[PDB]
Swiss-Prot record, chain A:
Reaction(s) this enzyme catalyzes, per UniProt: a beta-D-glucuronoside + H2O = D-glucuronate + an alcohol; 4-methylumbelliferone beta-D-glucuronate + H2O = 4-methylumbelliferone + D-glucuronate
Protein's UniProt name: Beta-glucuronidase
Organism: Escherichia coli (strain K12)
Annotated keywords: Glycosidase, Hydrolase
Gene3D superfamilies cross-referenced by the UniProt entry: Galactose-binding domain-like (2.60.120.260), Glycosidases (3.20.20.80), Immunoglobulins (2.60.40.10)
Binding locations of D-glucuronate: D165, N408, N462, Y468, E500, W545, K564
């Protein structure tokens, strides 16, 4: 549906994410039958929100738990809020969430990484305190995004199984708020910014105002007006100077007011004026070839799981800024909007990515046909499209987002793969014509076996695990890698971005033999990649797999949540960090190095 | 200035620790002269609050910065607040902050761990947005609490020098919030809990609010009214057997109303029925012998500095609950209020300490006399008093605080140490007679050398560095320790708490020789301490020195913030953790082990 970011502009909200809530594990799955949303959570404990619930209690059984959990908290509504259209919103409840304000069900949602909101005006009163109960579910199946298989042992004890790398953290990972708008105008905007030769150009506007006449005002960083538009929707105004550039990200403000006969609603929307477009093998930002550098990240840290935190965010950006990263990719799920906001203001280019990982049973009682009624089916497809919808509906206006990534590492060999993704690709294009589309490719689906990449605009290649198959031989790895890249170039003639490349590296482990798992190896490995990159013209970006060590699912090729990061989980740097700092900062900003110079 | 912890009712507040403010350094120190509060911070960057500024940017030059820093943020004041009174509160700004709303200077404060709030109604329009600017200072001097010295080298670069262990993290470490009160009540309240015997005793009410006739209703955990009084103050109530105990921590609620023809207001406070008494050699919470187990902690974490964090607090308590700790001490400064509330709600007892460390020049260009005018003059003693003042002003009602601490590891050797502290010991008792009092004792200032302990109710001893003075010998240390313990006992016949004991221990270091810095050694060390404890009837409390590794001042002795914890900075357990777990959960709750 319509998705705007709650901001304060004679519009108001009251953070509810003071994180101290009542928490309970519904081991027996009685909570719903016994209407737990009606009375206080029995035998509950204090938990923090935003935050995963898995690691807050240093308890393995809570961490590995699967099924239903219950969040509960009481809150006063601002009295001033009398007849003001009150809506309760959850920025993200990971996987499933159902909400009751005092015995009244108002909400249900399936995605773990996108916001949902409901009008609660008629269930609440200006001066009163209400009970808010949330039922959260962390179970994945073939119709969820991302997919999974719960395994129920003989004892009926649930056990989540999934096909992606990162740990399946759950809970309210993000801000939950209560906000206010005039009864006149609610919930949607859409913007498009065109550019010619960096001489002037226009900004296509269009939005719904929920029964109000809208006027539009484009304002400067100086807060001065530069263009006007009454056109309720379909406003088009030409501008004369300041483009949104990766280095700086100059931002304009679009003021959308909605005039009723009596009520007024004002919404400020930040605008970056830039064109994103593929031309041949180049990826153009304002008609300039751009070269990506940066990371595949992960919403992950020490006690908070995937819970959002302002400190982490400021620190990690200071690292990326130091290291010379000009970009990153929201690896395997949509990030907190505050992340994209930051990017917008600082000119960080982003590859916005759905939660669609684990469409692959070929990465080590599993179904033999990946695309089958039993496994990834029409309903799954429908869930996927829905995931694509809500992400786009949330992020279509961020200048930082230069590209949509529909899925990560699907197995595209089997029959049914192209039957599954062709419709998806088409849909996302119609949903947003402004941005190039992509689907991150697995290694074993190489140029000669892959059956989907032609349906997309830019080639994103995950080449992590080149050290697995090449058994840690650099000489061999460099020859094979250069072979495959050129093959991909001749096949698609698209821009190529390496979206994953790196090696598990144990911090502190040093070796004179420069062998696997040593800081020295991570350097040699990365360096071998960079050398071939500078030799291949179609390569327009390089994103190291993992900014920082994150927790992973249980396994043998797994070392304490694994060590794929350039930085540790506590954000300390391994040797490779300085190697990258040197390559990225010695580089002309956003310019691809000539054949290694 | 009265102190009331804000809470929602027909009373409201809006947290503005929305976490990102504009931020700038003032190296050139042009801030005030150039009237920086007037307009948007130039050349600024994003910062998060609550949190320290030091570690948010992975930059040494910012990390070790001394002088003024600038915080700035805009905020909409809710439109339903018009006729009501609007006030701006800071839970803590570490060291010094002054505030400008738009161009109106509303605030000034010294003491980095206490709240300060001002009525800003005249300078605020309900409908509008106001620019908040804060000038934060991290500099310490001798009149500062904790003391320090800044060296502005001939180059004109300022360098902060101080005398305590932990790093001098600064910034806005805790929540900042606007809040609403009607015109009928302003800041003050007080409560006491006499409990004479097994069944029921009384709760002396007290209250101070301008423009208000007071109701003062009491309440159960079930919201049933079990007692009432009418008097604006001096109220009192007698109840039945429902004791706040360290095991569960049963709480009550006291609803309080102040009333006018125009406006009315009910403030809700929580009450724990407990008595804190020292009977000879024993410490008492409700006429019974208690034995403290826990840690000396710190407000420290990766990235954030001393900034508050819920995930952090929920996790640490999980660990403390698991480990079997029933108590702890806000070591070397006042903790976040949330901590006390948690302790109150869970039944955790808290030795509450003030920011008064560094009063010692022994542990290592400095003044030759500790208590000279050059160092800790009378002007300092007032600042001290001020700091002890304000702590009690915000913690006197918290059931979990069973004891006050006026300072940590002061040097009592120099002539005229008692002249400085005797007044403060006595003066603070007049600020609260409800709770006993203690001063934490440095090691070298033993019974014979130290001249101040007599003015305190229970003895708090820091035996950390028992490994350093004994050059790592366990056989020797144990003898010296026990002998030194009994000397303290018969001198003052006092309840003795060991407030610090442990040894530098590098996680992941193992050794067959069980030598220093090895996880094995730590265990061996802690064990020999426990035995002597078991054999001394005077010891009513033990608290391992440091729950977790914390960042210290730039130190040669320091090794990665020196690794003094049972847990690592990222909360991973050392071997010792499993030892303290086994001992602490292997004994009756709050009960000292039999003669070992």
């Amino acid at each position: 549906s319509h998705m705007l970011r709650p901001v304060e502009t004679p519009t108001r909200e009251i953070k509810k994410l003071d994180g101290l809530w009542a928490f309970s594990l519904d081991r027996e799955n009685c909570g719903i039958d016994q209407r737990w949303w009606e009375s206080a959570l029995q035998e509950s404990r204090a938990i923090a929100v935003p935050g995963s619930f898995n690691d807050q209690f240093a308890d393995a059984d809570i961490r590995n738990y699967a099924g239903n959990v219950w969040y509960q908290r009481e809150v006063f509504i601002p009295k001033g809020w009398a007849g003001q259209r009150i809506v309760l919103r959850f920025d993200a409840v990971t996987h499933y969430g159902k909400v009751w304000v005092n015995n009244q069900e108002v909400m249900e949602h399936q995605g773990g990484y996108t916001p949902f909101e409901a009008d609660v005006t008629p269930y609440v009163i200006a001066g009163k305190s209400v009970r808010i109960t949330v039922c959260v579910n962390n179970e994945l199946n073939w119709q969820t995004i991302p997919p999974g298989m719960v395994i129920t042992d003989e004892n009926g004890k649930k056990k989540q199984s999934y096909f992606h790398d990162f740990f399946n953290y759950a809970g309210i990972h993000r801000s939950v708020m209560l906000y206010t708008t005039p009864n006149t105008w609610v919930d949607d905007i859409t913007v498009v910014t065109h550019v010619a030769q960096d001489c002037n150009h226009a900004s296509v506007d269009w939005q719904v105002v929920a029964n109000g006449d809208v006027s539009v005002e484009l304002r400067d960083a100086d807060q001065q007006v530069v263009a006007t538009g009454q056109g309720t929707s379909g406003t088009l105004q030409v501008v004369n100077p300041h483009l949104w550039q990766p280095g700086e990200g100059y931002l304009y403000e679009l003021c959308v007011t909605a005039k009723s006969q009596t009520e007024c609603d004002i919404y400020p929307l930040r605008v970056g004026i830039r064109s994103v477009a593929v031309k041949g093998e180049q990826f153009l930002i304002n008609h300039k070839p751009f070269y990506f550098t940066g990371f595949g990240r992960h919403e992950d840290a020490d006690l908070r799981g995937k819970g959002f935190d302002n400190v982490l965010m400021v620190h990690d950006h200071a690292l990326m800024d130091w290291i010379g990263a000009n970009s990153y990719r929201t690896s395997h799920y949509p990030y907190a909007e505050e992340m994209l906001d930051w990017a917008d203001e600082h000119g960080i280019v982003v590859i916005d990515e759905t939660a669609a990982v684990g469409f692959n049973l070929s990465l080590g009682n599993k179904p033999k046909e990946l695309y089958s009624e039993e496994a990834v089916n029409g309903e799954t497809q429908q869930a996927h499209l829905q995931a694509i919808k809500e992400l786009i509906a949330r992020d279509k206006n961020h200048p930082s987002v230069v590209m949509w990534s529909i899925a990560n590492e699907p197995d595209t060999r089997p029959q049914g793969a192209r039957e599954y993704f062709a419709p998806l690709a088409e849909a996302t294009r119609k949903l947003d014509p402004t941005r190039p589309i992509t689907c991150v490719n697995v290694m074993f689906c190489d140029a000669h076996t892959d059956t989907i990449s032609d349906l997309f605009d830019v080639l994103c290649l995950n080449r992590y695990y080149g050290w697995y198959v090449q058994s840690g031989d650099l000489e061999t790895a460099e020859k094979v890698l250069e072979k495959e890249l050129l093959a991909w170039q001749e096949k698609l003639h698209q821009p190529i971005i390496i979206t994953e490349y790196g090696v598990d590296t144990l911090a502190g482990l040093h070796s004179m033999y420069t062998d696997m798992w040593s800081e020295e190896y991570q350097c040699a490995w990365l360096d071998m990649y960079h050398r071939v990159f500078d030799r291949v013209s179609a390569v327009v970006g390089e994103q190291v797999w993992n900014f920082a060590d994150f927790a992973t699912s249980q396994g043998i090729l797994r070392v304490g949540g694994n060590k794929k990061g350039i930085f540790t989980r506590d954000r300390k740097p391994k040797s490779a960090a300085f190697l990258l700092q040197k390559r990225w900062t010695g580089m002309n900003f956003g310019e691809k190095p000539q054949q290694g110079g």
